Amino acid sequence: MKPACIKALTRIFKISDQDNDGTLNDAELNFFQRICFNTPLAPQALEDVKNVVRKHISDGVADSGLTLKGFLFLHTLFIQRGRHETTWTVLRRFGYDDDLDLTPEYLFPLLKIPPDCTTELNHHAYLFLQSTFDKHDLDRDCALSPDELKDLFKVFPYIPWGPDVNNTVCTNERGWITYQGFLSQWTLTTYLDVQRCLEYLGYLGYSILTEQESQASAVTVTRDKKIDLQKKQTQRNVFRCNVIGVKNCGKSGVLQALLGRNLMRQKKIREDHKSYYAINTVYVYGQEKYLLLHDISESEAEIICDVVCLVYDVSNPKSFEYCARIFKQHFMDSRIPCLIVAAKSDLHEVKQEYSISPTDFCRKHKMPPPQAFTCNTADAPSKDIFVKLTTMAMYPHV
Ligand SMILES: Nc1nc2c(ncn2[C@@H]2O[C@H](COP(=O)(O)OP(=O)(O)O)[C@@H](O)[C@H]2O)c(=O)[nH]1
Ligand SMILES: [Cl-]
Ligand SMILES: [Mg+2]
Ligand SMILES: [Mg+2]
């Protein structure tokens, strides 16, 4: 029949196939019937349907589970008809309108975020994404190969992730998005563009599979930053840090260090797949938090953060002046914590040409001492600065 209807039903099947085995078993079938038609068929009434399929087509029932061809056959057996309410009942249940398109109410639910508030995923939202990952990790490598990513995006109308995502979150030795990196990308997406995240949850059928009113049920909205500073206490799990410094001072090296990549692996990164964001889990005093690094290129929007990482290059006499300049310019009379990082510590330190030395600058403006850092290590770079950067974002008042 009409290709648009078949494409919609095909996607619905995929969403309904929660174990991604290519068939709908009795457990998945009953769930489907319950959300579409209130009540599932009796165990024998189900094998009656399966028999009807078996007598017409041979590839409609496999492991005593309904295949896509059998699913389409049913709706086709359902399409001779009069019968047309039952297919449309399924279509409407999965957010489609009369033109076989996902409704705006389904894809873009209303979610107002007050100023200076951030968006995170609740515990149940994460558990859904964890299930989503395992569903498509059919090789159990705890990573999504390009083929498995392609499989995951088959419910998407477009490819949601570019090749720069692999340079934004944790990947394995061959550049494949890790289970933890998968969660990080979703964490990153919810924080920066919650509207985009909700839309992606719609394509995955979050509200349907988890039986909630809207995709917005997955999002937790943190309280006002002003209150966090007043109470001197926050409940946020995700903190953003702006990385600021002159060109070629090693900012990109810092972001990639958070992902556990040393300098030479970073030299394997294609320039067209470069990312100006990096996010990974960080432990602070036994607490697991998310650190969100944003590489600010040297050029109110790009200053909003929970902590500032002022990076300078020790092999560059001109570099530290920028950190001083920007600090005085925007962060001197601010309650946002600042940390100075002496990047490229592996290189020979050159005398900085600023009027005051980096060390005394920190003590005068009552900042922590300049933090030595290098992403040029034999193994993975140290995550010390990231723990410290996160600790300061959690406790600015210290
Ligand atoms: N020796 C050494 N070189 C580094 C380090 N980090 C970056 N570099 C080099 O500095 C150059 C620019 O680094 P990059 O991070 O891209 O600078 P950015 O413009 O601030 O992002 C690159 O060619 C790197 O090879 C480091 O920790 N040690
Ligand atoms: Cl730059
Ligand atoms: Mg199945
Ligand atoms: Mg895999």
From Swiss-Prot:
It catalyses: GTP + H2O = GDP + phosphate + H(+); ATP + H2O = ADP + phosphate + H(+); UTP + H2O = UDP + phosphate + H(+). Keywords: Acetylation, Calcium, GTP-binding, Hydrolase, Isopeptide bond, Membrane, Metal-binding, Mitochondrion, Mitochondrion outer membrane, Nucleotide-binding, Repeat, Transmembrane, Transmembrane helix, Ubl conjugation. Ca(2+) 1 binds at D17, D19, D21, T23, E28. It is found in: Mitochondrion outer membrane. Residues 236-395 form the Miro domain. Residues 4-39, 124-159 form the EF-hand domain. GTP 2 binds at N248, C249, G250, K251, S252, G253, K267, K344, D346, T374, C375. Its main location: mitochondrion. Changing E148K: Abolishes the formation of thread-like mitochondria. Belongs to the mitochondrial Rho GTPase family. The Miro 2 domain is necessary for efficient ubiquitination by PRKN. This is Mitochondrial Rho GTPase 1. It comes from Homo sapiens (Human). The chain holds residues 181 to 582 of 618 of the full protein.
